[PDB]
Amino acid sequence: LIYTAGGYFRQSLSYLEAYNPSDGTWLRLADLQVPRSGLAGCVVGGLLYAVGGRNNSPDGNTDSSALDCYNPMTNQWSPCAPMSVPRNRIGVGVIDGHIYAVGGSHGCIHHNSVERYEPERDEWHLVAPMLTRRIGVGVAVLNRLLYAVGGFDGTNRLNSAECYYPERNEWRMITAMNTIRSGAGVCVLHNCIYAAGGYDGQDQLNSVERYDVATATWTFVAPMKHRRSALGITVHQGRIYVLGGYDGHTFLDSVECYDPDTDTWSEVTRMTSGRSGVGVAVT
C-alpha cells in the first residue's frame, strides 16, 4: 500500500494513512509522534521511516532533526537517533538499505550538507556536501547513484541536478532539467528520474519531465491535470501516484495516477483531506 505521513493543513499533522489502489480504500493508522510537514518518507526493510521536516503549530515552528520508524505489523512508531541538523523540506534516498538525508532548512540556513543513516546500527554520519544549497529538493536513486534535483537555495529556484557517487563520496553536476522546480515530486519509474510539478517562484506547475541517464537528456511527458507543489509522490505497480500539495490557492486532496504506456494521467481518488508537504512511501 501507499502510505502518507505528516503533512500540513492549517498546521502540521500527525496523520498516517494508507491507500490501496485496487480497492480505492483508505486506512487510518498510528499517529506520528511529533506533528510534521515538509518531511520525507522512505521504506527500508519493509519498515517506514519519517525524516526531517518541522512542527508548524499555533505555538511554534520547530525544524526537526528527528527520524522515526513505523512498523506495519505492530502499528507502532519508535524514535531513531536524530540527524546532525534540523532539515525542513528535506529530500531522502535509499541506497543499499541506507537512508541519505539531503539538504533542507533550519531557520534561514539552507543546507548543502548530506548525511547517511545506518538502520542496523542506528547511527547518522555526514558524507560529502552538495555543490548547491537545496531545500525542497527532490531525491532519487538510480543504479545505486543518488540524484538531488531542483529545490531552492534561498534566492533562486533550481533546475539543476547533481549526482552523488557513493563509492567515491563526491557530487557531480549533471544536465539541468528543462524546468525550474522546487518542491516537485521526484521518483524513479522505468529507468528515468521523473520530476512532477513543483513551484518556480511564479506558478505551481503541472508539467512533468524525466531524465534518461544513458543519453543524459530530460524529456517532457504528459502533464498532470492539476498544478501542484509540495506534493507527495511514489510509484505503485509501475505507475506514478501524486498526493496532495498546494496549488497556490488550495490544499489539494487530488490523487493523480500516471500510466507510462499511454502517457496519461487520471485522478484515482481523493485523500481524506487536502494537505501539503507529506512524506510518502510504499509497503
Partner: peptide, 9 residues
C-alpha cells in the same frame, strides 16, 4: 503564507 508549501510563515 509560503507561496510554495502553503504553510503559515
Amino acid at each position: 503564507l509560503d507561496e510554495e508549501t502553503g504553510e503559515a510563515l
